[PDB]
Motif scaffolding. Structure first.
Motif, short mmCIF file in Angstrom:
data_model
loop_
_atom_site.label_atom_id
_atom_site.label_comp_id
_atom_site.label_asym_id
_atom_site.label_seq_id
_atom_site.Cartn_x
_atom_site.Cartn_y
_atom_site.Cartn_z
N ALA A 86 54.28 51.03 99.01
CA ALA A 86 54.51 52.34 98.40
C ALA A 86 55.89 52.99 98.61
N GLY A 87 56.68 52.49 99.56
CA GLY A 87 58.02 53.02 99.80
C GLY A 87 58.13 54.15 100.82
N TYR A 88 59.36 54.62 101.02
CA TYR A 88 59.67 55.56 102.10
C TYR A 88 58.90 56.87 102.02
N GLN A 89 58.66 57.36 100.80
CA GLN A 89 58.05 58.67 100.61
C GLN A 89 56.65 58.73 101.19
N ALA A 90 55.91 57.64 101.00
CA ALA A 90 54.54 57.55 101.44
C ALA A 90 54.38 57.46 102.97
N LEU A 149 64.99 52.59 108.07
CA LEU A 149 65.74 53.31 109.10
C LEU A 149 66.82 54.13 108.43
N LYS A 150 67.45 53.52 107.42
CA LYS A 150 68.42 54.20 106.61
C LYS A 150 67.85 55.52 106.11
N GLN A 151 66.75 55.45 105.36
CA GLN A 151 66.25 56.64 104.68
C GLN A 151 65.71 57.66 105.67
#
Length: 225
Positions: A86-90, A149-151
């Motif tokens: 699902a990506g960083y937001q989730a 880690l970036k985001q």
């Protein structure tokens, strides 16, 4: 050389593998619960479930923080699989009240189908490492963690992540390998035990019956031997 399980300790172990109240709460800590039914996945060559792995990983995190050990944050088993799909937001949410940058080591248990593996961010060594007791390489998973880690850095601290000298990679069979498919969760836990102590990964597959018995014991007392 390995701490012994006295008579005594086996009696405490045997007793909890017995049939009885499946809901009986044997250990409660870290927001988690270990029941008789969770403990049973440690028995014979049963596949560990997530409650055991998470509970164990939290004990390592609790033990870090005693003097001289590297400090540790353990992500829960669902974190990575929620991140990959699902990506960083989730998952950005999951790290409120946690500054993932203030510890030495991040533990990331990796659930791939029926199989368990582990990734480890070590900020001291400036690198991200994947451990699989089957010898699978998982390039991708390390990049996904780097990208996270970036985001997280941008989001939590208003600065970009500094990748200079950072090294992403998988351990080949430079680590003891499994024979029993079902031992994968045990290798992941025990990899993490050595690593969070800065000790070499010294065991092999033959120590696994002993490690299962020991982890039952450890979990029940919330004491790592």
């Amino acid at each position: 050389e390995f701490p012994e399980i006295t008579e005594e300790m086996e009696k405490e172990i045997k007793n909890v593998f017995r049939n009885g109240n499946q809901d009986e709460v044997l250990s409660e800590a870290f927001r988690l619960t270990i029941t008789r039914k969770d403990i049973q996945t440690l028995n014979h060559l049963n596949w560990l479930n997530d409650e055991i792995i998470n509970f164990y990983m939290n004990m390592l995190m609790e033990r870090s923080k005693e003097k001289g050990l590297p400090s540790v944050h353990a992500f829960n088993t669902f974190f990575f699989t929620k991140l990959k799909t699902a990506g960083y937001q989730a998952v950005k949410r999951w790290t409120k009240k946690v500054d993932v940058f203030s510890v030495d080591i991040l533990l990331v248990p990796i659930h791939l189908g029926v199989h368990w593996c582990l990734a480890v961010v070590d900020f001291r060594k400036k690198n991200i490492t994947y451990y699989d007791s089957m010898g699978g390489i998982n390039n991708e998973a390390c990049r996904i963690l780097l990208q996270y880690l970036k985001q997280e850095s941008i989001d939590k601290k208003r600065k970009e992540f500094d990748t200079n000298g950072w090294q992403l990679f998988s351990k080949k069979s430079q680590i003891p390998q499994q024979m029993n498919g079902s031992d994968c969760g045990m290798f992941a836990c025990k990899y993490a035990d050595c690593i969070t102590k800065d000790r070499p990964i010294n065991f092999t597959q033959q120590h696994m019956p002993y490690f299962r018995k020991r982890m039952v014991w450890e979990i029940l007392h919330r004491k790592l031997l």
